[model samples]
Target chain A: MEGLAGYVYKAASEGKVLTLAALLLNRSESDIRYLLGYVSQQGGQRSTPLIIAARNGHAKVVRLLLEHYRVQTQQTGTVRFDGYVIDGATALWCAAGAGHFEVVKLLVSHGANVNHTTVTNSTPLRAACFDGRLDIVKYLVENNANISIANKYDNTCLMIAAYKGHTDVVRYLLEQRADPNAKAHCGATALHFAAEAGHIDIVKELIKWRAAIVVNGHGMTPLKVAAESCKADVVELLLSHADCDRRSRIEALELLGASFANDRENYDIIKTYHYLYLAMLERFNILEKEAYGNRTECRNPQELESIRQDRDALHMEGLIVRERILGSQKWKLIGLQR
Target chain B: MEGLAGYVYKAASEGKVLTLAALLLNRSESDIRYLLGYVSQQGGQRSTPLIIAARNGHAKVVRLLLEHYRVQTQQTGTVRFDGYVIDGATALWCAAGAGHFEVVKLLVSHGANVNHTTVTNSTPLRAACFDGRLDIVKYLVENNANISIANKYDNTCLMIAAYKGHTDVVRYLLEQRADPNAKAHCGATALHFAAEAGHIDIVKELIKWRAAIVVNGHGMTPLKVAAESCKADVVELLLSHADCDRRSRIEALELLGASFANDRENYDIIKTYHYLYLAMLERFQDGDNILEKEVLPPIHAYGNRTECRNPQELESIRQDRDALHMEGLIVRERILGSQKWKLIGLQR
Candidate 1:
């Protein structure tokens, strides 16, 4: 860590650049200029001073590397950096990911590829959006970075914002007309991510923007994803939305059955089970009330008993999911861990 | 990213798990402390405070989380930490890969699974080896992390170390008598990786340890891999080694001719072409210098074995052109953006 290259990397990593420091270390001007293009191996990884500086949000060093010292091109950004990398990002991508507004602005001004992506095609815009760099996201978007592109998994900027619960970014993107229903490779829209994450506000906004409440490629709707992941608030929100629809009731009932059958031991799952159970009975009552009004069909006492019996079965099943194998011993096990 | 869970995740990711910082922010110690167990969502990814703490090598925070806060058990560490991971790595896996030796030490002491691997089954030992963590590799191996196990790509720890040109680690593993000849799914031995990486020193050491230089399962010898990868120094080393015997000469010539035909843009391939041409012509004088030796019956024609002007006439009709196309030429192109890769078990 004592060479000119090492000093340069450290300077970049620390976000401060001093010409006097290079001189104090006995580095020639040529050494400072050349080291920007030289990717020295540190800890068995090849990285330029710029890459390290940009990653650590060293705006001044990044500016120096781009303006004065850099061989200043994609010349040094070509190697496949395998570690600590998300899709082989460039300097602009790294700065944008770290949420360094000044560094990002400088890199973009110096002709950094705004849409440069990693191997899976994760763009700088997607990186900023995922990291919740709203300012950088806005800057890149205005600079013509595409919002509709997807990465290897088909995750877009909007999807990541909703998933990470960046309500501001989500609202902005929606307002800017980014597709709210853009699905990933798994056929999950931004609503699916927001709902599963229990971001009720984002979900509400997405639905308002016409995001679908249907099942994903896995045959689980946004509501089901919320239920399976144990987001009680999201489940409640969707249940209320579904309460007004006949189809939503049938879907809620189906998902409630699936949740019980696919049970795993966790307080969250238990909570979800109870909530969905309550929601299912409410759906039954709502459908019955509507059907009774039409006089086409009506609930019988026997059918009502079926719902009651189903509730009892889940209570027993819930016990097994929560360590009925050891029953009384389950509390003792939790006690040890606690 | 402003809620309690969000703030906690940002703190953990930045490794600033300072109790004083949390307290200074006016968060209740009990609230932030218990929230260490609460999983936060980031870009549709689920991560707990302890998970990211271990991942970023924040040993102090990790110890605090394990000690004062965590549901205080070998809980939460067992679930999949990968949809989300590069090779399906867990918290311990990331710590080891990042060379956070102390973080790895604390987690393993608290019952982290050292043998727990990516969905593709890349264990801590393999991860450390690839990341060039010699000390971590040493620590895990001493703790009984198996070295013989391979990943979904059938890549063993030794193969990864050798491929990445970690000569010191390669030497350490060899001294411990780790399997030098263990093959990947494609039959690529550590020697093949060393040669492909152009690590001349490792290639020399592997040869000294009696590693074979024959065709791999994909029909490539170590010499051929070096030649194809454009490692001129490695090619020279292997060619000199094979110059000792007639059968060796036959193998080298066969591989050399194949390399020239499968050439891309490199000066080394042309150099190899001329060297093999001269060697083939000289072999004709020594009886069966070319493919004509195989077709024409062994004849001790003292001075009559005239050199052919064109080398193309020496082509063997028995040689299948289809066989020249390499079987295992598809190199790994890692697509790191897909967290969904873990759900599918790295099949893509």
Candidate 2:
């Protein structure tokens, strides 16, 4: 905030105010109140002093800037200083975006709107959520910060929680009937996010409220997504629908069957996949076993490398040679990818 | 009909006569003088002449044989014949199984139990529905055939109609409140069959009647069947429901996608099919494009075939080589006819 209008600035009417007032030689009541409001909105960082104080975690200077100055109010009528420029932002926007909590807290104590939407439409709670700062969230929420405020992207706190698989946050928001049914710009709702994230609990909770787990813009329901991925839990949830549809069932089975019955015509890819899977198991000793440890029994290093080498050979050596042998064997070439 | 016994056979005189006596012997009982009160049930499918007349479609002769000769009471009663063999069927069972209305009428007139299940548990009404013979179905129903008769296979008439894609029959049965939810032995309900068979009309009707379309059976449902086979009409009908499962859509799409992906994988087989399809297309000159005709385009006599030492070599040798190459390129090979690799005639 470079003062442009022969203006004197203040941070909690702090040191910046003292120097600038000396430089400009004139300051008034409206200027004082307006400047106080503006700087507080700007995260108490007006001049170099405030920015340095915040960057260095100088909580004392930060406090002085927010407390004694109206650092975060909407700017009012002005034009007394020489032709210095004015900015549209308040200090709080600056501090929250920059994650300066000392300045944030000082501004908050002076009655800054905790639920204020920044240019990103992000409330203080959302900013805290983004930073995963628990106390900040608690402070903001306790001070009536709106957690459900949608940003420019129409994403609320619940949507964020669903996206991150943050079950506790999601559960808390859901307890408040946080509009999990809300859709994003492309119409992807919280349910869609939960489904994609495999947040099974959120998915079930959403479905319990009839949140349309099966509703999809592309004819894909959550169950369909789960089915495509062969996620057993999602599939199981889908199957438990009191009104499971026959067409959907057939479609699901067809998908399941096709996953197994991929190519009956030549069955090459199917054959190769089976062989590759077997090779992964036998040669690589990668059995498809489920265990809890990071070092699973499924795969080992050396064998995996060798198996990959052989898989590469299937595409390059055999297919290419088969193509070349065509002219000789009355010959015809056929390339089959590994 | 249940209380009739004919010809006074047992001294006990179990009541199966009076009903048969009037119908078979043309005896004019005033309902007052009820001498042959237990004859009706006993007099069904009596004499060889009567059976032959019915088989010959001679209604008048059948009546004559039954009435003039008292055939049910006198003739077949003394004849040593296996009922199943002599009639080329057990009379009651055949009457039901083939859905023969007049035969069922005649047999039931002389007292065939309309609701009796054979060893196969196919009651008269179920057989009518199974055979897609609606007139017989109506007659059997009018004769008090139990609508709830699920055969040994656990299929009702509604299920049979669904299996055969008899959409109207299914609609009628459902309209009559036939069990839309009754699963057959394999756990497939009528809706499953209707959906699987691509009967869009039946599917819509069944779903409209609150049939549970998504019941678990054979790890599949009707939508899966419709989707895999490209029955898009049926798919749309199913998808319109609020509870149309998302799994169904994904299943259908993934099935279709996998099939397409699988087609993309079997490049060799598809190439062969392309050549064959195009070759046939070029000869037509009619430009009668088939649904899959895109796989064959503006063509000539094997235009894509490569040439060799001679022009005939270009034609014959290339084709043979291509055929063999295709056979080799086919990635998965397994036993075929006779459960062995030796492919042969269609085993007809």
Candidate 3:
């Protein structure tokens, strides 16, 4: 008799609609209502039949649960399965987090709060954004889900979507005027996260929406972060932006070269030296052109000719150029080393 | 004319009550309403006078703004300051997130929605949780703020509090029945976060509240995360819990040893080898006591080699340049077997 709730929980989780119907067939109305509201203390937590059904994407069972006038759509339960243990999750939250569009729609139509948050204050739309569930995201947003709900860290959906490289979700959120420039607690914007994660397309989209190239708590701009993380394409893209000033662009280029040089974990010696050489050449071209002078300050004509003629000399020249530009101060900034 | 909105924004932000009061003193009610609702396009975003005042903790300016019959407490505007740019932020959210308890209370008392979320669906309570503002949190909860509100990543206030090592906040939330066992979108519990962050007190509190020693989406337990992060205290604390089975305890101990070995950034060679040797001894004691055997498998050099027979000589050998290194290799092979031990060497 005590195991009745457990059976219902199992039946709903496995979508055993006939088994559930059979259990309730001959029961009195009060008994049936009690069974519907019974909380199953299975899997080391309390979960209702409706929560289990919705979490498992059993639309039929969910429908059956909602059919009962005693069913509580907004009742939260402990959803623990597949090593996930979320407490205070509404049926709508569970369905949306699990990417069950059908279950999500059924729950919303049944008056589940589309804005109902979990224990962490995560809304259904935010849950969908975690995995870039575009379909669920669109539906929730259409139903008036607030797009600006941040996490405890003030990390918004745009930040997470951009960080996860969800191109379509980011585009959609941006189109809906999701604040691309909103900063987290650490002062990181969506562009900063996207840049650090090397999401080039997301970076482009965020920049298109006027996402500022701002500094974080660490005083690192998006370009600097991309350079330090060895994101070559993202670094190049950031440097090309008009908002990136001349000094910042040059510094980022140098930082990228230093990053490649120090990061033997991901880059080879040849690639490292090649980037260093390119960075040095670009600096010489820009700085010397700006000064209206030849590149005679760091190296003489013979030294330049020698570097051009010999690969080892070229590599040495790159190393010397990096040493001069970065010095010990900048070297300390590139913390990682071979 | 164009600078009228800018002056109002500045005066509100700086709490210049006289400047704002004088600007609207002789104005018509309709004009005053327009001035109060004006959106300043400064700082690369849109912000109203009320938002600026509340974000800067200007209680007087906030009061003056709310005094208007047309004042909308739930109205949202862009809030940019100190390099933070959050759109769709209500005055109450800015105040709570900024830790201005007075402004927050005032806004709520004036019919501001307690559950009003920012552009990212972050409630004012969650914003307060980010900085562990227990005062604001209690007020919001008192005003019907839902404590179960999660962020977009399913990260609860408890998770953040645990992660940030806010002992008082974690205790309060737990007492309030905030889910101690709730998992984030990545299946990480507050215990997992506290353990990974090496917050032993927060870890202890979560464990007391029955935070399960569960595996995250990465197949990592709190003990495993603590071990991998080289949090020796956290690893010891987690192992002391009854919920950590013997197998998991032994695995975590061994993993902690391996983590210390691989981590040269924080651990010294002597400390590294010492932990490795201790882990070896623990394994030997447990396994041999269970199997009723001696340490006779690999060291047959003398055959049993010239080790342990001469105490002074063994002491010298222990201090020998490569003796500890060689001994560590033998024990590692015995514990992890030859294949995995070879991989550890390869990583070196």
TM-score of chain B of each: 0.71, 0.54, 0.78
Interface RMSD of each: 24.7, 35.7, 25.5
Residues B157-177 of candidate 1 have per-residue lDDT tens digits of 777788878888888888878
Model 3 segments beyond 4 Å from truth?
Answer: A1-338, B80-84, B261-266, B286-348
Task: Give the TM-score comparing model 2 with the true structure, all chains together.
Answer: 0.33
DockQ, model 2, C-alpha based = 0.01
Model 2 CA deviation exceeding 4 Å by range? A1-338, B1-58, B64-90, B257-348
- Alpha carbon lDDT of each predicted model: 0.61, 0.46, 0.68
Candidate 3, residue A111: how far the Cα is off, in Å = 46
Model 2: iRMSD?
35.7
- Which residue window of length 10 is worst by lDDT in model 3 chain A? A329-338
* TM-score of the first chain alone, every candidate: 0.73, 0.51, 0.79
List each candidate's DockQ score.
0.00, 0.01, 0.01
Give the alpha carbon lDDT tens digit for every residue of B225-334 in model 2. 56545465676676666454322343344333222223333434443333333333333434442111111111211356321222233244333434434322221110
**Which candidate number maximizes lDDT?**
3
CAPRI-style grade of the A/B interface in model 1: incorrect
Docking level for model 2: incorrect
Candidate 1 lDDT over residue span A1-338, tens digit each: 23655666666667667852453356555345445544555564445677767777777677666675543424223223323333244677767776889888787777665655454556778878877878888988877676775675667788888888899999989888787766676778888888778899998998888877766776668887776565657776887775446555544543443455443433344443444455446555255432123322114434333434344444444433223111232321121110
